[PDB]
Write a protein that binds this ligand. Sequence first.
Ligand SMILES: CCCCCCCCCCC[C@@H](O)CC(=O)O[C@@H]1[C@H](O)[C@@H](CO[C@@H]2O[C@H](CO[C@]3(C(=O)O)C[C@@H](O[C@@H]4O[C@H]([C@@H](O)CO)[C@@H](O)[C@H](O[C@H]5O[C@H]([C@@H](O)CO)[C@@H](O)[C@H](O)[C@@H]5O)[C@@H]4O)[C@@H](O)[C@@H]([C@H](O)CO)O3)[C@@H](OP(=O)(O)O)[C@H](OC(=O)C[C@@H](CCCCCCCCCCC)OC(=O)CCCCCCCC)[C@H]2NC(=O)C[C@@H](CCCCCCCCCCC)OC(=O)CCCCCCC)O[C@H](OP(=O)(O)O)[C@H]1NC(=O)C[C@H](O)CCCCCC
Ligand SMILES: *[C@@H]1CC(=O)N(CC/N=C2/CN3CCN4CCN(CCN(CC3)CC(=O)OO2)CC(=O)OOC(=O)C4)C1=O
Ligand SMILES: *[C@H]1CC(=O)N(CC/N=C2/CN3CCN4CCN(CCN(CC3)CC(=O)OO2)CC(=O)OOC(=O)C4)C1=O
Ligand SMILES: [Gd]
Ligand SMILES: [Gd]
Lengths: 569, 569, 113, 111
Amino acid sequence: TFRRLWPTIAPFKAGLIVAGVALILNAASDTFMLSLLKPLLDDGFGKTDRSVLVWMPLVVIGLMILRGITSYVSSYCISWVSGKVVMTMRRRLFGHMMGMPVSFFDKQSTGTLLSRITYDSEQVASSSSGALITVVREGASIIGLFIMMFYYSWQLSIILIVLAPIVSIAIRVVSKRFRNISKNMQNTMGQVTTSAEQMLKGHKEVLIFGGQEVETKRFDKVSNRMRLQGMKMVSASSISDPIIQLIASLALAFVLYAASFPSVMDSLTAGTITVVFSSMIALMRPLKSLTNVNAQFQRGMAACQTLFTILDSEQEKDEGKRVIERATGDVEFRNVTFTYPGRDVPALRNINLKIPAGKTVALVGRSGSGKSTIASLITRFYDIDEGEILMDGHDLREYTLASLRNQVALVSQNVHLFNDTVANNIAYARTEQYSREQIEEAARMAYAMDFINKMDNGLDTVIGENGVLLSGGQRQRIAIARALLRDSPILILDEATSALDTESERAIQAALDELQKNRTSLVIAHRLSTIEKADEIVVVEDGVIVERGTHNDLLEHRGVYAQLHKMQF
Amino acid sequence: TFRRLWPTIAPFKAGLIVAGVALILNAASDTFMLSLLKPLLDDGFGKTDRSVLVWMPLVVIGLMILRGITSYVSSYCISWVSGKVVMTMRRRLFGHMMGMPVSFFDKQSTGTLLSRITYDSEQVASSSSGALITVVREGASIIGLFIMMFYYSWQLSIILIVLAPIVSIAIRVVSKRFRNISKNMQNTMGQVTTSAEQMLKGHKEVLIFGGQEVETKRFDKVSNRMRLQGMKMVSASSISDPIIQLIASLALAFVLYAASFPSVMDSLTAGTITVVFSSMIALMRPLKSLTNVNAQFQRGMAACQTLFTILDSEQEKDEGKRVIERATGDVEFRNVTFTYPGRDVPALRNINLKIPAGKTVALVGRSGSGKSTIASLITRFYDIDEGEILMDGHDLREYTLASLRNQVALVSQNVHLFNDTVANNIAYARTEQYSREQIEEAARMAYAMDFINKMDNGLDTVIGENGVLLSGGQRQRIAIARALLRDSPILILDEATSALDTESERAIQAALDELQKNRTSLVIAHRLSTIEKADEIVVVEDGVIVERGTHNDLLEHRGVYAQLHKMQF
Amino acid sequence: QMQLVESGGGLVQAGGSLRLSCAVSGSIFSIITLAWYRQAPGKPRENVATITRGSRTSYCDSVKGRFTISKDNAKSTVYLQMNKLKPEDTADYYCNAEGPAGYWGQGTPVTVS
Amino acid sequence: QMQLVESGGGLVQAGGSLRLSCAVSGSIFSIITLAWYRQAPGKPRENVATITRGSRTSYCDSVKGRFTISKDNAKSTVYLQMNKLKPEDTADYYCNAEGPAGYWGQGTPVT
Ligand SMILES: CCCCCCCCCCC[C@@H](O)CC(=O)O[C@@H]1[C@H](O)[C@@H](CO[C@@H]2O[C@H](CO[C@]3(C(=O)O)C[C@@H](O[C@@H]4O[C@H]([C@@H](O)CO)[C@@H](O)[C@H](O[C@H]5O[C@H]([C@@H](O)CO)[C@@H](O)[C@H](O)[C@@H]5O)[C@@H]4O)[C@@H](O)[C@@H]([C@H](O)CO)O3)[C@@H](OP(=O)(O)O)[C@H](OC(=O)C[C@@H](CCCCCCCCCCC)OC(=O)CCCCCCCC)[C@H]2NC(=O)C[C@@H](CCCCCCCCCCC)OC(=O)CCCCCCC)O[C@H](OP(=O)(O)O)[C@H]1NC(=O)C[C@H](O)CCCCCC
Ligand SMILES: *[C@@H]1CC(=O)N(CC/N=C2/CN3CCN4CCN(CCN(CC3)CC(=O)OO2)CC(=O)OOC(=O)C4)C1=O
Ligand SMILES: *[C@H]1CC(=O)N(CC/N=C2/CN3CCN4CCN(CCN(CC3)CC(=O)OO2)CC(=O)OOC(=O)C4)C1=O
Ligand SMILES: [Gd]
Ligand SMILES: [Gd]
């Protein structure tokens, strides 16, 4: 249980335990100061001018030095462990979403992953560290004060030890009331924020009907309501303290009277009552903060389970065993049907594509429907719903992704560039295999040395985000440089360059010339040249391979291609 | 200067004055509490009689009652002027948000509008509230503490009254340094947080190249840098308190020494010295809060200036004077040319579109470019760049917008529904002018009562959000029902539906057959029926009036609509 | 497996009219292209009739106001109606689905007397 | 307000070829649909040829395969070339821009 929570911080006994030993001292020094306040009253100022008046002036600075130094040491060497657990938990959490199926990035949570990891980890250990130092130095204070209080009186503190549970329960019940009251305000804020957001969405539809005034009326009645809820918040919250303060004050008054009812008093040295009173009122910062440490254990476990909901979600399927050395085969579709996880209308109906090795197929459907996603099936991102995407005589699900995704080369213009050197991008995830001697001529064969030399260093310019920002058309040229270096057997263009750029196009159409010399290639064609020089053009009218065939036999057969050739005449 | 802004808060003098005068007391309570300590020590346990201090417990309970009571009194009536100022500023800001040109809603800040009204106003209100409590409670604490220090001592108080401002200067100097250190750390956080985002941005480009192995290392580097930045934060943060309190303690040591160096002092009883030490070991909360309050004045003023900048933006133009009653006329365009603020390529070239009286013109467009914005000039959402949109012989710039937008009824698929009574939405912004006997006939006339009487409350039903979720196709039915009751002479059906409701959309078409027996209508078309009965068809191809005629005189002229009639045949 | 079956007539008079049918199975029949070629004893294939997703008609330059393509959405069946026959049109007519690299029925030759 | 001016021929022998031209000035010549219509002395107007933004040309029927039309990219002028003339083609020819309910030129009768 708690015994088995030990190994997660196994290499961190050193700093944490040093923090603990320098964190109990921070309470012991607080105790020693009041202990020294005891003699300064009676013996110090009774019948003497020194021996207290000379000790104390420098011993007080000594103890505050020993208090400041221990505060620094505790904070810093507890923050070291806090940060070195945040870093390792966040590192594992990130390493468990590079192996997450691509459905996870369906825009539902694409932007919220960074926020998730950073906020969750910055919250899980801030709460745990705060609770740890709020259960030791807020917990050593109590023991130290009670020791120093029993040593100075035998009975005056018995009433305090009997009384303290009253103060504790009062503080806890008042805080629990406040927390319980604070529950429904999430619902109230939702109710009012929804109205406010719905209110100014239809700006066009408010102007056009001439209803500005009857709109400010509704907003003034919403702002009135939301201000009333705010005042309810403050009135509920602000009376958390002034009642537990009254309770502890009743405690103090009971003690003060009890110190004088029977003849038991008069054994109180003139300064003993001073240090007893001071040690009692100083005991309000611990005793009050100690009850409300469960409020941080609960938050810590809440955040821990929150991340555990994610650190163990669904994992991209790996259930294959075979391997590839080279996919010199004819990729076969068959009766494949596929509908996005989270969608109802089938994106792809029956299919019979038979891309043969060494040749190309041009996916050109005007509807812009279904062609973009016959590139996310052959590479096993979103798996098929029914059918078999045969590759080199075998299925995809019989093949380990490690080499399947290494075969295909997903050329496009949207190829995200890593923030590293350009000649690191060209051989990315393979920097050891390719020596820059290869990379130079590889940039050549994909037409890249030309816009690379004009850079400041050479094939060396950090190029990614916050880098140099290569041109949209030069990003296609560098995507070819990558795909040409890798020497892939199956190529997947994407021709995202609907808006063509001249001159760059010459070197682009020239580069794509070398890439598609062999290397069977599913090209999502949109440019007259690729379609014209393709080998089996294939259209997809929003659900299905409608009209398929070679070009010159296809223009004669109108169907849907001629009517789509005219639109792009 | 400062006096000038008091009339802005003049109506709240009662609340703010009660706040001040019940705030002073909460400080006076502690001062008189320490004053109560002097008899308890000097006479209660100095003198033999036990009745000397039986006066204490009642008076300490009474003073803690009077501290809690004024705590609650001055928190609340400073959270009621905190509310009746944030409310009025939010309301005065949203009443200058429904008058900005539609271009201001160009999606650059659509979500922010609720925040601008709330988060910044909450910021200014909370900052000013907190600042006022801590320059008056603390300010009069200090005055009270030093008044009760003087009445009990002379030399100690004089030594303290000089060496404390040195602690104050120390407090600020340790702070200003912390702020200067923390200034650039926001930039550091931005720089470090950018990179994680980039890597999870291109997850596809990681899988498709087999490069998990060279992303674990990169996030290892980034996580190490982030952790080290956090540790630098903590290390620089935790030298504020353990240093200012060291300065304060050294000052206290000087107090004790130079308060007991000669025999001139030590006239102090055992009580006056405890009172001096008590007041000062107490004085640390005020002398620090009152000194760091300037961290809020400039911050609250910054938020206030943010609100005054967002308020002082550009009002929608209103440079018109004419008032129209019911304009039946040959509205026209002439050489219009128009580009959205924030873009380069114009959307509209020289246009001679001409809506005739009675007749209706239909807009059809293959690529969906340039149609919709002809409905955002005929109602003056965007002022035209070069041209003159005639309307009975005047530019639309010269009509009072509230009297021009009072002529155009904009039916649509995506009409807005205010969360109110159906009897309102069918007579929105005019429920005073129109009685329910008009709605009774109108909602029938658009064939929509069949969709209303089925509901729980009929025309009392809440129809928007938190309401009955009226179906999209029937929101168009309600848009007709509304535009019937207004019975405006210029109609702008968007007919961008594409969605089909069997027999129901047929009843919607029958309704439109009643909507446009009159009412010169510029209907942007995607349906066969509207074009078939259209009186003058005007087709735009992405920038300009390309072809324009009538269906029976067009389809023989092969043009561009006929070769689009084939595509939606 | 998608397939098609074609039915047609035989020897008929010149200048007459006929209707030739073709039923398709294993098909998403409403959206695929559908077509009818003709193959002469000496000449190779060349499309004459074509019907489409939206149901549209196209023919050879010679075939204009001469042939009629139609389909029954429910029956999974298409038809070519031939009017004003000519002796030069004696050939073998081929049903076809889903483009020239699609599918090819048996085809039924028709002789013009 | 634009204007378009026609240039053509007169009377020629049947079976020949001719060329008519129409220069359209005062608008965006690249995109606007240009066209050529003809009208008999007795019969009303009718369409002959059409040319579009991407120069997708289209023609009537009785003169299909016999006529041609094109337009210069910047000269702002549309050429309609006529081949294998017939006696029935004696009629008044007009050019047109922006559909059949817009601008028209003076045109010219041709025999
Ligand atoms: C030669 C020989 C000499 C011998 C030497 C002996 C000396 C000993 C020295 C060490 C003693 C140590 O043992 C004690 C100590 O030092 O601990 C402090 C304390 O724990 C801490 C919190 O402050 C307390 O709590 C409240 C405010 O706290 C918060 C907040 O919640 O608002 C939290 C936090 O904000 C937080 O920050 C977080 C983070 O930043 C932290 O990084 C944030 O996460 C959050 O912040 C944001 O977010 C929020 C929310 O948004 C959420 O998100 C907001 O709410 C927020 O506002 C904020 O915006 C969070 O809230 C924090 O940062 C702070 C922030 O600054 C502002 O926001 O605000 C205040 O009460 P209120 O009125 O406000 O409710 C308290 O003030 C009070 O008047 C106490 C009051 C309480 C009422 C109880 C009354 C009695 C009940 C009996 C109980 C019995 C039950 C059984 O009794 C009285 O007065 C009555 C007078 C006496 C009556 C009796 C007389 C007749 C008999 C205040 N209490 C005290 O000061 C106690 C003080 C006593 C002072 C009272 C009088 C002094 C002498 C009395 C004479 C009587 C003798 C018989 O100590 C003693 O007993 C001294 C012993 C006496 C010896 C002298 C005799 C010779 O402060 C400091 O902290 P440090 O340790 O870091 O320095 C700590 N240090 C100091 O103050 C001083 C420092 O020693 C310098 C000393 C050098 C002096 C040189 C000249
Ligand atoms: C191109 C070649 C040619 O000579 N055209 C017209 C041929 N003459 C037609 C006589 N038409 C008279 C009434 N037309 C208006 C209705 N048209 C449909 C009925 N038409 C037969 C009676 C059949 C035709 O399309 O063209 O017939 C629609 C039409 O505009 O076509 O012109 C016409 O003469 C007037 C060509 O079109
Ligand atoms: C429609 C129905 C029919 O019988 N056609 C044939 C008319 N004679 C044509 C001669 N053609 C010879 C070379 N053809 C192969 C290439 N063809 C493109 C060039 N064709 C002119 C020369 C244009 C034609 O469509 O038809 O040509 C493609 C072709 O259609 O092949 O037919 C052919 O005779 C061989 C029809 O056109
Ligand atoms: Gd041919
Ligand atoms: Gd006709």
